[PDB]
Amino acid sequence: KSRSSRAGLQFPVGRVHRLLRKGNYAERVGAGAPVYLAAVLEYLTAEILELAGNAARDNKKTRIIPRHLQLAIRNDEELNKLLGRVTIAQGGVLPNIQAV
Amino acid sequence: AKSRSSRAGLQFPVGRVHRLLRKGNYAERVGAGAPVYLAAVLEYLTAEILELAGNAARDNKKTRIIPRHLQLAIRNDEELNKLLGRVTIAQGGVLPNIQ
Amino acid sequence: RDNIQGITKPAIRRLARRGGVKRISGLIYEETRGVLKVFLENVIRDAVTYTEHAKRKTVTAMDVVYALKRQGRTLYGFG
Amino acid sequence: RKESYSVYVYKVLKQVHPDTGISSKAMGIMNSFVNDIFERIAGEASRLAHYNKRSTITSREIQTAVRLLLPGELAKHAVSEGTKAVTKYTSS
Amino acid sequence: RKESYSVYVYKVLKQVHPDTGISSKAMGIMNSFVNDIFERIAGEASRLAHYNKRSTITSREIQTAVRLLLPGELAKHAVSEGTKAVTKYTSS
Amino acid sequence: MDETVAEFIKRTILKIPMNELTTILKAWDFLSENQLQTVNFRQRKESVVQHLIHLCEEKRASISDAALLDIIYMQFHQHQKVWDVFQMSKGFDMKQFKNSFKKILQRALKNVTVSFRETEENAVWIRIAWGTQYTKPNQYKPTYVVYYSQTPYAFTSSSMLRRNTPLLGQALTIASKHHQIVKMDLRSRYLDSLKAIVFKQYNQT
Amino acid sequence: GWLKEIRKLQKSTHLLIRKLPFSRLAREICVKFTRGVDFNWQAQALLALQEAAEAFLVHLFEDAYLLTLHAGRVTLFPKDVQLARRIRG
Amino acid sequence: QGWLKEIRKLQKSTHLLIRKLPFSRLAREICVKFTRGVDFNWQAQALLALQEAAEAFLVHLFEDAYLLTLHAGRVTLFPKDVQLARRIRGL
DNA sequence: GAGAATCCGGTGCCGAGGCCGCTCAATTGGTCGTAGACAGCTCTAGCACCGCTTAAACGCACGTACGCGCTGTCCCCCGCGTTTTAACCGCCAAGGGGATTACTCCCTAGTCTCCAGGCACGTGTCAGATATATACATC
DNA sequence: GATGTATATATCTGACACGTGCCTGGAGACTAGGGAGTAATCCCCTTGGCGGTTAAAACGCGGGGGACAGCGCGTACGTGCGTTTAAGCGGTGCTAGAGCTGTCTACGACCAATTGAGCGGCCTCGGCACCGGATTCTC
């Protein structure tokens, strides 16, 4: 009967609605908005973690570490434009070599 | 029967800024002393940039401010160039800059 | 007594190797010690303000994260 | 007493991957990811409640904020998935 | 019915200058200047009502927002002028 | 004046509660009572100290007067710190003692800050701000010495900054007319218990 | 020569500037912008300063080296670093 | 010479360096390709606004990209210079 | 040592500032709930320091790989003169829809009430880290 | 062909995935009142087109100006190697400082009357934009 399971999501809906009430964003908050918002956040989280898990798998390690998210972000094209002004702790860089 | 800016000793309004700062939904509670201070800050900024503009206006033997004078008064001063960095003034043109 | 020479002559070399530079010149060792210093001012003067406002003598990690977010260079990994 | 988003990211990771573990530091990155995108979209859509002289945030404003804040194909997939969530939310 | 800030900029210009006229286009620039700085400061100080878990905007938050949003000497002159306005506002 | 001592005086008066701030400012004896009458004592603390600094912007300021204000602040908050008890042996005006201690300490290191205050039962409260030979003396971590002319005992405040403890001990032993300094087990919070455990033994040796 | 050194450092992830000199530098610069007051950095925030400083310097030297290959150089002169800041603004 | 007079002349006046109707037809052609079928009305001030933004952006881009031709010893621009100038920023 | 650049004057013209009507939004004033300043107490986590120890920097000597100025060559933009062309100005019609008002209705907000979920705490135990030792890749 | 270069495993080491207790924030319910969605309307701002001009763009051409390629001297930089210095571990102390729990009070929302400060429309007239004229400058 919970609003997370009623819409078939995984991210919470009551917490997002609580942060849209107490966030000073508008005077009234509709009911059709935060379910849409949680669905978009769940899609972006799955979009990152799929590439992160595949890059972790190709390095023969069964654990996700921030170097793997660094590689997955900087190798993808869409997240290169979404996260283009982002530094990541314990990051490292891409293996960039260039000659003359 | 008595004006707010006249108590403030200022020239920018006070009730209009307070009205926008309530209706803008910036916080659910607005302190009373805030928009007077904010209007004084806005008055000092506009006074500084017009005081820099009028000297360049008299430098070009003119008395009517065109946007080129505002462009020059922004770009020649250092600290306003730090402030208004990512702003393209309309009808402005560029500084005389060669080589 | 040197106070900026804690940045060493090869630590700049390690950062240039991470950047991918084959052969550093000379006076770079006197140049980078300028630039870093300037950048730290535009964090620390921007990060000592927030902790001044909340009546705290402790400069937490969230304050530096907020100052770096305000500068434009968003940092994620801490909090 | 100080909440976070670790459990939900862990559930999504165990959904789309069988047994791929995640360290306790990189999970922190995910917190500062998704306490950030929510700051953009649900911030920026608030701005569209002000230009049109409204006072509500419905699903349409969040839809336009997703159309703005994301590049092309990712935005198309997100807007295609969100209304798919809303339609099965309405007929509860 | 659609207000602006032309009259007040004209009064400040006639205060700090005797007869320097201003065109009807450049005055428009001043509108989009000072409907902008007010969007920054009184926007950004609102953020400092959220990090410290408050609900008010007093003079101190606007003071810190001016300390942040302006470079050095201009910020020093502005913070020196604003409290000078407030102190003669208090003893009304 | 410099623009460092104003922050110190502002922070010190912000630490003072409103219950006895007028008592502190009357006992400090630095401003005119008409200027005490001018200052509103009914608004909040975040502007009363601004008005008091703006009084002290005009007339007079130093580091010595701010240090003496810090001494009077510390004399009424003895519940906060934890004290230590010393004693000298192997061996009188206090003016020569002040001059000897200040000259020995300023010959020991480059940058120190010494401040005195006279209190009854021949007491002297000595505030020391340590430093190095390259930096300014840190005002915010002082070291306080309660010294008595009659008894060879001295009460010692702890601090974050150690490594100057045997230097201060030998400089105060040479600064006094003595040769030995001890360090007993007596480390407690309240000054009256240390006072009693010293004076029950000293007055009735 | 150097080529075994680059491909070792673009693989690891640890800090390069040592923690204690960077801490002393931050405590030096901080005391000038607060009117002579000490502070107490949490042991987490200095990592945030150091990570932002490393990321900024690495991106800066990458762009400066992109400038050095334009003019036929391989060597990275101080004319190159003071030009990759005025372009970026 | 000639160019030394033209740099002094064009940096003095504040005109529009691009003609109106070709820029308007280009903006309408780009606007047709998004959300097809319907036309889109343009107010007469909005096209002037977008033209001022585009002129200020292109002038700032050429003035920024010229500094990578004095740096290489050359005098003349190249498309390598413009593509590198966009590579530095991140646009 | 004279066409080109700069200052000056005259004249139309048109927008900038003064002026009036007015209306609605800012002022004044009295009411009440409550947000936050203020004090004091409690755990904790940051700083100072020290002994060791050892990993890395420091200083230097030297070989040599690029930096740079020079110069020859060849190609390639710019100024110029002629021809062509479309941008613009002003007008004239017309009509699509932008802004305004009415009106009902419905949908979100507030308050109360009930309990299932998400967080802090604690713990065995597998993932990797580093370390040594041994089978391939190569200028 | 010796120096890397990848792999087997040793074990050991601690983070972490997991299980439990538990406090409180999320769900159910429902009224109610302002937000707004739909309907109509009328003007007002935009679109389309005729037509004539006039600056403005396109196109050949040649000529100097500049980019590019080779090259020699040399010097400023990498590397090898002994030292010596400062950085890390880690351990102790140990206390300033976050924070958080009550309180009480000044203070800001909330609301009815009312009036002038500021907005809309209008009308010049001086400031200014342009056109033509008289006084300097480098090749």
Swiss-Prot record, chain B:
Highest taxon above the source species? Eukaryota
N6-(beta-hydroxybutyryl)lysine-modified residues are 23, 82
- In UniProt terms, what function does this protein have? Core component of nucleosome. Nucleosomes wrap and compact DNA into chromatin, limiting DNA accessibility to the cellular machineries which require DNA as a template. Histones thereby play a central role in transcription regulation, DNA repair, DNA replication and chromosomal stability. DNA accessibility is regulated via a complex set of post-translational modifications of histones, also called histone code, and nucleosome remodeling.
For the modification N5-methylglutamine, the affected residues are 91
Family of this protein:
Belongs to the histone H2A family.
**Subunit structure comment from the entry:** The nucleosome is a histone octamer containing two molecules each of H2A, H2B, H3 and H4 assembled in one H3-H4 heterotetramer and two H2A-H2B heterodimers. The octamer wraps approximately 147 bp of DNA.
> What kind of modification does the protein receive after translation?
It is involved in the initiation of both imprinted and random X inactivation. Ubiquitinated H2A is enriched in inactive X chromosome chromatin. Ubiquitination of H2A functions downstream of methylation of 'Lys-27' of histone H3 (H3K27me). H2AK119Ub by RNF2/RING2 can also be induced by ultraviolet and may be involved in DNA repair. Glutamine methylation at Gln-91 (H2AQ104me) by FBL is specifically dedicated to polymerase I. It is present at 35S ribosomal DNA locus and impairs binding of the FACT complex.
Question: Which gene is this protein's source?
Answer: H2AC6
* Molecular function, one GO term: protein heterodimerization activity
Q: Which residues carry this modification: N6-glutaryllysine?
A: 82
Q: Where are the N6-crotonyllysine residues found in this chain?
A: 23
Q: Where is this cross-link: Glycyl lysine isopeptide (Lys-Gly) (interchain with G-Cter in ubiquitin)?
A: 2
From Swiss-Prot, chains D, E:
> Which positions bear N6,N6-dimethyllysine?
25
Q: Which UniProt keywords apply?
A: Acetylation, ADP-ribosylation, Antibiotic, Antimicrobial, Chromosome, DNA-binding, Glycoprotein, Hydroxylation, Isopeptide bond, Methylation, Nucleosome core, Nucleus, Phosphoprotein, Ubl conjugation
Give the N6-(beta-hydroxybutyryl)lysine positions (modified residues): 2, 53, 84, 88
Per the record, residues carrying Phosphothreonine are 83
Dimethylated arginine: modified positions: 47
* N6-glutaryllysine: residues bearing it: 2, 11, 14, 76, 84, 88
Annotated positions of the N6-lactoyllysine modification: 11, 53, 76, 84, 88
Molecular function via GO: DNA binding; identical protein binding; protein heterodimerization activity; structural constituent of chromatin
The molecule here is called: Histone H2B type 1-C/E/F/G/I
List the source organism.
Homo sapiens (Human)
Gene name of this polypeptide: H2BC4
Swiss-Prot record, chain F:
Assembly, per entry: Component of the CENPA-NAC complex, at least composed of CENPA, CENPC, CENPH, CENPM, CENPN, CENPT and CENPU. The CENPA-NAC complex interacts with the CENPA-CAD complex, composed of CENPI, CENPK, CENPL, CENPO, CENPP, CENPQ, CENPR and CENPS. Interacts directly with CENPA. Identified in a centromere complex containing histones H2A, H2B and H4, and at least CENPA, CENPB, CENPC, CENPT, CENPN, HJURP, SUPT16H, SSRP1 and RSF1.
Which keywords has UniProt assigned to this entry? Centromere, Chromosome, Kinetochore, Nucleus, Phosphoprotein
Q: Where in the cell is it found?
A: Nucleus; Chromosome, Centromere, Kinetochore
Q: Identify its protein family.
A: Belongs to the CENP-N/CHL4 family.
* GO annotation (BP), single: CENP-A containing chromatin assembly
Within the intact protein, the region shown is: 1 to 212 of 339
Its biological function?
Component of the CENPA-NAC (nucleosome-associated) complex, a complex that plays a central role in assembly of kinetochore proteins, mitotic progression and chromosome segregation. The CENPA-NAC complex recruits the CENPA-CAD (nucleosome distal) complex and may be involved in incorporation of newly synthesized CENPA into centromeres. CENPN is the first protein to bind specifically to CENPA nucleosomes and the direct binding of CENPA nucleosomes by CENPN is required for centromere assembly. Required for chromosome congression and efficiently align the chromosomes on a metaphase plate.
This protein's GO CC annotations: cytosol; inner kinetochore; nucleoplasm; nucleus
Swiss-Prot record, chain G:
Where in or outside the cell is it found? Nucleus; Chromosome, Centromere
User: Which GO molecular function terms does the record list?
Assistant: chromatin binding; DNA binding; protein heterodimerization activity; structural constituent of chromatin
Where in the sequence is the signal peptide annotated? Answer: none
Q: Name one GO biological process term.
A: protein localization to chromosome, centromeric region
GO cellular component terms, A-Z: CENP-A containing nucleosome; chromosome, centromeric region; condensed chromosome, centromeric region; cytosol; nucleoplasm; nucleosome; nucleus; pericentric heterochromatin
- Phosphoserine-modified residues are 23
Q: How is it modified after translation?
A: Ubiquitinated. Interaction with herpes virus HSV-1 ICP0 protein, leads to its degradation by the proteasome pathway.
Described function: Histone H3-like nucleosomal protein that is specifically found in centromeric nucleosomes. Replaces conventional H3 in the nucleosome core of centromeric chromatin that serves as an assembly site for the inner kinetochore. The presence of CENPA subtly modifies the nucleosome structure and the way DNA is wrapped around the nucleosome and gives rise to protruding DNA ends that are less well-ordered and rigid compared to nucleosomes containing histone H3. May serve as an epigenetic mark that propagates centromere identity through replication and cell division.
Entry text on domains: The CATD (CENPA targeting domain) region is responsible for the more compact structure of nucleosomes containing CENPA. It is necessary and sufficient to mediate the localization into centromeres.
| The gene coding this protein | CENPA
